[PDB]
């Protein structure tokens, strides 16, 4: 794994467009983000803990799917025989 915050740092999206993009800029301002702790359940509640992220829960879930896909996926390609 690699600090979800840092992973997100790669998507600073200097020009928000997609749901994940707008979220990235927002998270950048989250100086309190649990950089030293990445857990779906723990962080999930962190979002619901504030209506600010409540209106974009679908984005976080989607982001996670991408995150794990890059880490939990690695060079273990299977479905795509390319």
């Amino acid at each position: 794994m690699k600090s979800f915050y840092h992973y997100l740092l790669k998507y600073r999206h200097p020009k928000p467009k997609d749901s994940i993009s707008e979220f990235a800029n927002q998270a950048y301002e989250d100086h309190s983000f649990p950089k030293t702790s990445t857990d779906y359940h723990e962080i999930s509640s962190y979002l619901e803990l504030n209506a600010d992220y409540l209106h974009t829960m679908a984005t976080f879930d989607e982001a996670w799917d991408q995150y794990e896909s890059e880490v939990h996926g690695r060079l273990e390609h299977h479905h795509h025989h390319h």
Side-chain angles (χ1 to χ4, degrees):
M1 274 57 151
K2 62 227 197 301
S3 188
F4 185 89
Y5 186 74
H6 304 353
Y7 172 71
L8 214 73
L9 257 162
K10 183 161 179 175
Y11 283 119
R12 271 180 53 180
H13 277 104
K15 286 189 90 66
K17 282 192 288 195
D18 318 296
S19 80
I20 207 175
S21 312
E22 46 176 274
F23 184 95
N25 334 99
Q26 190 191 354
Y28 173 82
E29 321 196 270
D30 200 326
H31 287 38
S32 47
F33 193 92
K35 315 196 188 176
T36 180
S37 188
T38 157
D39 170 81
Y40 189 69
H41 325 116
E42 194 191 76
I43 284 167
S44 275
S45 315
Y46 192 70
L47 303 155
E48 301 183 291
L49 264 151
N50 310 282
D52 295 79
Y53 302 103
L54 182 63
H55 76 161
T56 186
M57 273 251 73
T59 300
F60 170 65
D61 306 311
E62 195 67 77
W64 197 266
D65 172 67
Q66 302 272 48
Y67 177 88
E68 62 93 45
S69 171
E70 313 248 271
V71 195
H72 211 69
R74 214 188 84 85
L75 273 297
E76 306 266 74
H77 49 274
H78 193 244
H79 62 312
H80 207 35
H81 311 270
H82 295 241

